[PDB]
Symmetry: D2
Subunit: 292 residues, 4 copies
Amino acid sequence: VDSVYRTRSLGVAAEGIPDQYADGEAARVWQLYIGDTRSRTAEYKAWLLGLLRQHGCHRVLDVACGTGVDSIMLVEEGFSVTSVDASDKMLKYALKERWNRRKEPAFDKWVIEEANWLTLDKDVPAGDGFDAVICLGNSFAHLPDSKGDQSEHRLALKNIASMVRPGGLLVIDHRNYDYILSTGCAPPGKNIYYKSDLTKDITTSVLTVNNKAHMVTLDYTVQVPGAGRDGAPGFSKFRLSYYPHCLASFTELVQEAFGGRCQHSVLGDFKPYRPGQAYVPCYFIHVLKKTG
Amino acid sequence: VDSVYRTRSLGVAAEGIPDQYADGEAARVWQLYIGDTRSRTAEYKAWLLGLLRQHGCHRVLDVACGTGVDSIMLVEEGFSVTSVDASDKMLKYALKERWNRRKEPAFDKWVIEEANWLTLDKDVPAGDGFDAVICLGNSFAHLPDSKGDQSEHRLALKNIASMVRPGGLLVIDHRNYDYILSTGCAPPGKNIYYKSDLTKDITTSVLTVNNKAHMVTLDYTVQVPGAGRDGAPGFSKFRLSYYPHCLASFTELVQEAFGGRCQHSVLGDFKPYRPGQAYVPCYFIHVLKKTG
Amino acid sequence: VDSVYRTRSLGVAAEGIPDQYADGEAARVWQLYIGDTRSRTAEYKAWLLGLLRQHGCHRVLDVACGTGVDSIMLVEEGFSVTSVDASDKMLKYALKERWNRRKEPAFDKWVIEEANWLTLDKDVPAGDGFDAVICLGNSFAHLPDSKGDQSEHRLALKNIASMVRPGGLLVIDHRNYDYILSTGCAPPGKNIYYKSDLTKDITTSVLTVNNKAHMVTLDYTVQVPGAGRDGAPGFSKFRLSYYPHCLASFTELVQEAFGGRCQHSVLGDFKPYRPGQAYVPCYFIHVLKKTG
Amino acid sequence: VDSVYRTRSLGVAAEGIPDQYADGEAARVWQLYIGDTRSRTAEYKAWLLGLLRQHGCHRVLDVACGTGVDSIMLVEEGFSVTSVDASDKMLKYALKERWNRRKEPAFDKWVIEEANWLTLDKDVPAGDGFDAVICLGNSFAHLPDSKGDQSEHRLALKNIASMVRPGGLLVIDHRNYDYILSTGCAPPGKNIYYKSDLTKDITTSVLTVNNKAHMVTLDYTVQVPGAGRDGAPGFSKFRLSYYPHCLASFTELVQEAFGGRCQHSVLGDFKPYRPGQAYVPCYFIHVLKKTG
Ligand SMILES: C[S@@+](CC[C@H](N)C(=O)[O-])C[C@H]1O[C@@H](n2cnc3c(N)ncnc32)[C@H](O)[C@@H]1O
Ligand SMILES: C[S@@+](CC[C@H](N)C(=O)[O-])C[C@H]1O[C@@H](n2cnc3c(N)ncnc32)[C@H](O)[C@@H]1O
Ligand SMILES: C[S@@+](CC[C@H](N)C(=O)[O-])C[C@H]1O[C@@H](n2cnc3c(N)ncnc32)[C@H](O)[C@@H]1O
Ligand SMILES: C[S@@+](CC[C@H](N)C(=O)[O-])C[C@H]1O[C@@H](n2cnc3c(N)ncnc32)[C@H](O)[C@@H]1O
């Protein structure tokens, strides 16, 4: 940048806290999108639990709470979890669940609050920090690169990492965009995080600005059970936008978030991942262990 | 007893008259975008004039008038031209020009009216028709494919062709999208239609929906002479969207517009074009000659 | 002998679920707007409780829950209350409160759900009905008369009344619009429902369409404690719109909601009200007792 | 902690011009709205011409050109007129007219350019000034009082006055808002400036903010000849907003624009006006004669 900036300000304000779930439709049918939460959680439940235990983790912070899917599981499995999320439309359901099982000592001590990765540091006073932090379900990819540089990405990734107690863990994932970008289309159905026969369609939309992948927009079509007598089925339609993080780049990004003081590894779909391997994962789970 | 009959559906996007130049910023600086109209017109002036004359053309209809660039030239060259355009923001300047030279017999008799390809048939009563029709400057590509099918494209192309008197000519062009789509980026500066050192930047933006190129959006940055004392330069920014017509497809489309009753040919940048040729043209000029 | 036609009875496109509290700013500072909930509730607490008791009411439905102000009081006073509201942004706080006191048997049995007067009948299965229904705080006036006729008003008022068990009560209020319309301005500070020194300003805005009061829009300015070091105070600004219900009209409307099978009465600010009386009430509390 | 009073006032509202005629619908049917321009101009033609002549006026500047109605008349009557207007959508038609009669020496020398009262001083170099300035047809009332104080009004009124050569005239009018505000409704049909049987309806809309008239919004319904076969008539709908200038206030405002160096007078509908007079004028024509 030339010269010095003394008077920035903003004469035009178009965008502003853009909560993609503010409309509320995605939340209303998330359950329908996920399908059988038990069937979903069945996969990687063993791995996540095993990993958490192997590193003696008891305090877990879920920064992508959503409707509570994984927070709930960790709660049931005896962990001390606190869940945050920026969308009060989503949290609204996790809360609903907690209240429903408010008579279970475990759930009584479940913490659910609103927070944003961009301002996590101030939203969730980590203090000593957590034994483990989780960002599953392709949540981070929602963060856009509006500023031109992945600054936002870096900041958010930093704050999140800042919640990991030394020797703690960070499990953050993202869709396999190395494939979506290559084929223009996102994998059809049979997803480990979202496996519901209710989801009738997912239309991709890749936007490369000046020859560089800038954004992937998915348009979902989830059939709301019923929505019309026999002969007329009804559906719900919502759209979500993600930054297509290529594996290599994220690996670098996330690692940098820890200032290199960490141990990085990545699995395909919670299975070991070696480039060139036959199996093409739909998600890439990054496992980081802070050391200093 | 079913019902009556309809043409449109209850799901397609009917848009809302979307004049991309309605905002007026593009018009305000078009002159700056084109640069030296004389230098511009210098190229292809010989060819256009030569072609028009070779086919004894006197009545010329310009469906992409814009600010009048090519209509003015044809007027000065003794042709009987009538120019139409959908943007009254652009026409506004051609008009301004005509009035300025209202004392030149040639210009008195210059006709400038508003019209839209989609409704050309009713906007411009061709009656007998024109000896030649021109749509230069990558104007047609503006028409979107909202309806799902290139229906709009077909209709507009039909109306335009319908203005060509039998034996008449139709010179319609478009950017070389076979290259833009391939590289993601549009060629930098040094354009035959727009050659101005004032244009500092043109950022592309390819949007492929479900693996199919759907739209190319260019974001221009033209420096408005002055716009700040020495040390601080000022610019103007506007965006235009085009349907990326691949050569082969357009050839087919435009030909069909004449019901096959025509003679088709296409030049690179007003030079002969042979696929695989070294030179990569920035535009593709289609020359059609109605026969029946 | 068999027909055809179409739909669309309205002329404009209207808004679409227009939750005035959807933005969330009014909720965020409602507490600041009300002031000392205890001080507020102090007034009319005796009357409300006295009235409820005098008619042997135990089951109370609060259709204007809001942040829970009056639902909470009723809960504490040993009533069996269920609260509904259309704004999940407001309810969000009542919920928050209930959870906080989740250890109090009373609050454990407090029911809080989302609902809309327009669809109350389906949102809250009254079944047998409630002993009393309350709509305090000038909440009903939010309902607009978009349809041209007070149809919406009539429907909502009907649904609400439909929740009152025979012999039950309905306490519904509204601002004294007979005065606002007359003076163009709403009363300044010192309100029985909202008494906070934090509210710095309330700008009225009367919109009479073709000589008939159509809407009153209030623009609030509530100082958020702090919002700047000494020397610089910070405020929050939000707007709410109400239909200016003139007393006489509402009396008629609400009574009609009960099909005349009721006993109507209205108090000034929870004090007896006689037209022409010196004291000018800020609100009008309508007390209805269903008989059949 | 630098300076609270730098230049003027740091507004964070908007930064766009709000051309009420930008949409273009009002222009498209203005002709229909006015009706018989000849019949319209018939009234006050004698007065205007007489007044202009009585004060030896030859150079006339029309700041509310519109479609050219009154500019055209003055041109035909041998005056040297230059017309400006902010709406290029309206001017577009005056221009169209001038070109049509481009062969009439009179019209050849007719000047039509875009300009805004707010920046008149820089848009139209008055230099020596004009013998007379006209702002007829309730045009000035369009200027809003967004800034809170009638600053804009004062500035615009100043610029306009600044175009009047000493000893020159200024004819500026406005609707009788003292009546509209009183009755809520605007006079029905039979207007001196707009007398067309095509205008089927004009719905008012008075917005008084905190008991002070802030804006009058009129919603017009003009039948576009035809717009449907026999049995189905078609109309066009547009809305315009005005600041309800009460007579007394405008007299004060406009006079101040001349720094008191003027001779003021006001007529009803181009007839003498005495308060309390039986006849209720629809417009108030202010006649000012600069003296110094
Ligand atoms: C795909 S959803 C998660 C669904 C859930 N994890 C599951 O597995 O079903 C992504 C979540 O990211 C959250 N999110 C997006 N941007 C955020 C931010 N800046 N701070 C906090 N949460 C954010 C949203 O609120 C959204 O619920
Ligand atoms: C790139 S500009 C032309 C510039 C000019 N031809 C030149 O060479 O400088 C494209 C023009 O297409 C016109 N246009 C777009 N859609 C149109 C439509 N449906 N009917 C008529 N004109 C249309 C616009 O008004 C715009 O001026
Ligand atoms: C002024 S607030 C109530 C504040 C609270 N009663 C108090 O006394 O502080 C009005 C409430 O009406 C509710 N409301 C408006 N329209 C509604 C509708 N159609 N159905 C249900 N609630 C509605 C809103 O959600 C809003 O919280
Ligand atoms: C009611 S119309 C005039 C119609 C015409 N005078 C007649 O008598 O038929 C008002 C005109 O005021 C013009 N106008 C509004 N604000 C303006 C401004 N700030 N500067 C210049 N013209 C303005 C508009 O462009 C509009 O054409």
